[PDB]
């Protein structure tokens, strides 16, 4: 698709990970993914203008071009390479097909991963999760991948669903679903069939949310986060909202518990501006919540350990 | 009132609870109640279009007519009796007494036909007519009410809860989530020996640490939307900050214990007071639809076991 | 400033704390402060129309003029002297300067304090914290003051920020920051340099929010509350909102744990009506939340003890 040309050309023009990064985690590359959502996708822009300091005492540094200098130990910097929006607006009114989104996402991820970057995708409908971990499995066939999936619903009963395809193709070592509260009968079958591990809302709430210290894991983890996992009071901008969800803080805490050798990638999606609750200054509530989730997600790619 | 005619005619035309329903809990009958709220009452419709799967792995099935087949499968049949007020049957607004007679009659019909009545919308007055209908049919049964609200709502002698307490139809009352308790409220509390669980007390104790609400008598569940924090359910008159999250309420509801459910009333929601998304979906509608669904699940699974 | 004349006229005409107040805590005086915020400031009016019963079975009684009768032992009344808005909305179109707001606040606070009242300021940008603590320090130089500061940010990296000024002038015995989740490197330096005690969001959440029983203290405490300490879902009406904050109930609980002999003053600020989320009937969500926080704040000024 010609809609992704300017973006994709800039991606494979990216300077590779320097030698000064050897044995260090990162760096992180960030791009905007808009499949299945309205053409106007403000989430990436909103995040880039958000404050850089995190919960844990570190600070994002954003760069539109390389080379990405590896920061010294004493400097709590976390470099992010902004690759901008995948879809170049005003390159036509054409809407990229699902397959075109997949190919565009697959290539960008392949390119970023090959150059030593941890890819973080922002926006869209979750299909980026499929193309991103397949790009990783292509480059690193021997690595075992486990996905930590935050979602109000399992979203695996449909054979065309991104997570279902990954399980069907046998590309996944394991899946940990977090926050489900709308589980269908078919969802339960796919659960038992693919031996999925799950932590539903009602269960983790009654055990105590802050009593979750970690999600133990030895394999490289992909972090897939549907905004629907949050309660509509925090993230209203989702199709078919499910009340009784995680607070933004709840989500941040569980994210911080993720354990593993490295982060293979991050997908933050499910956000639709047409569905958001807006302040009087026309700032959307869900964009506020996700901008924070994206930030602390990036911090995770830099600080994650097996224990 | 002629505004309820179409509805009431359908309710007493409802096929009675089959013999398959055995010694089982249920089934459930659902109707929309609009007393004290604007004519446009979208909560029932919004609930009907919501997904059917619950927190606990069961599934609502909605039916518009009998017979209600007793499921062998984790199905939970709900009989939709629709709105009580028939729109475009006149521009008239039913009086308080008309709303009372209508709900009383409907509840009486549904109850003795074996259904557990669930009322959605209105201002809480349905609680009065529903347990009075139960007490009329089951004079020997003792009734205890679990009442979720930001206010005790017993200072007014005309209150639905106060009338039931004054007529001595209630064995006991458990108030949950009160955070605006008046001096007059406290006097009525001690006089009727009401058990209460105020927000500040429940919170510092640990919300999730609430395992049970122990009880041996048939429970009525009365839920005012105002029990929830305005961040989750803003569509209430005189909102009180510092309330329950929707999840908090769902967890406390799940801890309710008892032999059976006499009825459920979900009210306090006014569409004119809601926070709306850009697509004009109301935040309070979202929260309440879930609470109704998990409330129905309670009528099917409640037990005396702690 | 002629904008504050009518207000100040009424304030220094206030009848002093009667002999009945004995050695009782209170009474409380309440005024509207609007520095750094839009001219229209509706928070005070919204509080005055709110229910007067508290969480802890006491009742606010609002009075527009003295003398403030001290209620009997068995009567759970908590008298509040409403001094109204500082800025008179019909004395001209002039916008008071920062210095004029400071001087006006300093004079009002001084006047109320020496008349035996505990001053509670509502609205503005947080600059009232500076002028009120200085007003108290002017009158009682021997008293040691500790501030309990609820905020999403440390807000001490800027040499002009109220909390930094107070620390630089050495008017503070100690500072307890609560709920910070956007801490900069500059913030960390000021923290260590001034021995500031802090309780950041991620920390207090993982340790158990309800498990916070008290904030032990022996010195008179000033309570400074930035609305931004609350999650945007509860208090959206803040400049540069930070997701993952406190629920209103979280804040109420932490406030209740605050210990001390007396309250030197209370400042509730950070609220901007232009940034609020509104119900269809045009009631702002942040106003609902803050109205409650103000009420339970007044309750603390009547019930605080070192135990």
């Amino acid at each position: 698709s010609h809609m992704f040309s300017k973006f994709l050309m800039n991606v494979k023009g990216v300077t590779p990970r320097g030698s000064d990064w050897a044995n260090r985690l990162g760096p992180v590359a960030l791009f905007g993914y808009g499949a299945g959502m309205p053409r106007r996708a403000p989430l990436l822009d909103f995040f880039l203008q958000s404050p850089r300091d995190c919960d844990h005492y570190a600070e994002l540094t954003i760069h539109d071009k390389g080379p990405i200098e590896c920061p010294p130990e004493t400097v709590m910097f976390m470099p992010v390479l902004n690759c901008g929006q995948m879809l170049d607006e005003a390159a036509g009114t054409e809407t990229p097909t699902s397959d075109e989104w997949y190919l565009g996402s697959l290539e960008a991820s392949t390119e970023l991963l090959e150059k030593g970057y941890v890819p973080v995708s922002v926006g869209g409908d979750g299909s980026a999760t499929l193309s991103m971990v397949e790009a990783y499995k292509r480059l690193f066939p021997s690595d075992d991948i486990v996905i930590v999936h935050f979602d109000a619903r399992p979203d695996v009963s449909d054979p065309r669903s991104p997570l279902r395809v990954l399980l069907d193709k046998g590309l996944l070592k394991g899946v940990v679903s977090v926050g489900n509260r709308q589980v269908s009968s078919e969802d339960r079958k796919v659960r038992k069939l693919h031996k999925m591990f799950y932590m539903d809302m009602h269960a983790i709430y009654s055990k105590g949310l802050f009593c979750i210290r970690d999600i133990r894991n030895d394999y490289p983890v992909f972090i897939s986060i549907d905004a629907s996992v949050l309660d509509p009071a925090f993230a209203p901008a989702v199709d078919s909202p499910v009340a009784g969800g995680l607070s933004t803080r709840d989500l941040l805490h569980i994210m911080n518990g993720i354990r593993g050798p490295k982060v293979v990638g991050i997908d933050v999606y499910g956000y639709n501006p047409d569905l958001d609750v807006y302040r009087k200054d026309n700032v959307g509530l869900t964009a506020i919540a996700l901008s924070k989730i994206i930030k602390e997600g990036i911090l995770k790619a830099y600080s994650i350990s097996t224990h």
Side-chain angles (χ1 to χ4, degrees), chain A residues 1-74 76-307:
Chain A
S1 180
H2 58 280
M3 296 293 302
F4 304 148
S5 74
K6 186 193 177 186
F7 169 85
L8 284 176
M9 199 60 187
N10 175 257
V11 170
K12 35 194 179 180
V14 164
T15 69
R17 175 179 183 256
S19 65
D20 48 332
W21 279 98
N23 284 358
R24 293 251 295 179
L25 287 171
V28 167
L30 167 67
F31 61 90
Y33 184 77
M37 292 299 179
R39 171 174 270 251
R40 168 160 140 75
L43 187 50
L44 176 59
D45 284 336
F46 189 81
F47 168 77
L48 292 177
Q49 62 89 47
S50 295
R52 326 273 207 271
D53 293 286
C54 311
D55 290 321
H56 300 68
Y57 312 97
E59 172 189 2
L60 299 180
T61 62
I62 316 293
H63 319 267
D64 298 275
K65 60 186 179 184
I68 299 304
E69 277 262 339
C70 181
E73 59 169 11
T74 45
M76 293 305 217
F77 283 175
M78 294 184 305
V80 180
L81 179 65
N82 172 31
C83 296
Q85 307 261 23
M86 188 177 303
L87 178 138
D88 175 33
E89 298 184 15
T93 71
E94 298 84 16
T95 300
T97 73
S98 307
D99 298 327
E100 289 182 308
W101 279 109
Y102 171 82
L103 293 180
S105 170
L106 177 65
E107 181 168 348
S109 301
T110 297
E111 199 67 62
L112 292 176
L113 284 166
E114 172 54 42
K115 296 184 175 185
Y117 291 84
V118 173
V120 170
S121 182
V122 165
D125 54 13
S127 63
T129 294
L130 168 61
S131 55
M132 283 169 82
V133 324
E134 267 192 327
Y136 187 95
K137 221 58 171 68
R138 258 210 312 196
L139 297 183
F140 316 103
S142 300
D143 273 27
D144 285 322
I145 303 185
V146 44
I147 304 187
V148 175
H149 187 215
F150 297 90
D151 203 324
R153 42 210 151 218
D155 278 328
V156 292
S157 64
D158 194 328
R160 290 203 172 275
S161 168
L163 190 54
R164 173 70 173 276
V165 170
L166 293 176
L167 287 164
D168 286 345
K169 289 187 175 186
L171 308 170
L172 269 37
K173 180 72 178 182
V175 178
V176 182
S177 296
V178 185
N180 299 166
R181 48 190 187 273
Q182 183 187 311
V183 186
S184 67
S185 180
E186 266 299 304
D187 286 332
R188 260 112 63 184
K189 294 184 185 59
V190 186
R191 276 182 169 180
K192 188 162 69 177
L193 179 71
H194 285 285
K195 297 160 186 173
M196 292 189 265
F197 190 78
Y198 48 88
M199 289 182 293
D200 289 15
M201 261 315 281
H202 78 270
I204 60 178
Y205 179 82
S206 63
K207 79 173 290 182
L209 285 165
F210 62 93
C211 287
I212 299 182
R213 284 302 139 180
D214 24 28
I215 300 183
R216 299 150 187 84
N217 188 81
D218 308 323
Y219 312 101
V221 294
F222 185 93
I223 302 169
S224 187
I225 304 178
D226 193 324
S228 70
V229 72
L230 296 165
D231 193 277
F234 300 87
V238 305
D239 180 72
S240 181
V242 189
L246 294 170
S247 73
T248 309
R249 196 74 245 177
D250 292 337
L251 179 50
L252 287 174
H253 176 86
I254 300 184
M255 289 178 60
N256 198 38
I258 298 298
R259 308 289 179 235
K262 61 173 292 187
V263 171
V264 350
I266 299 176
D267 190 12
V268 181
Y269 62 91
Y271 159 71
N272 184 348
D274 290 343
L275 309 173
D276 213 3
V277 170
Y278 287 87
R279 316 193 307 180
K280 191 177 192 164
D281 70 336
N282 295 310
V283 170
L285 243 50
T286 305
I288 299 175
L290 288 181
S291 174
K292 176 69 173 178
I293 298 299
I294 295 162
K295 176 161 63 184
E296 307 296 330
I298 292 172
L299 165 57
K300 192 51 166 183
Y302 277 110
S303 63
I304 187 177
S305 71
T306 64
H307 222 310

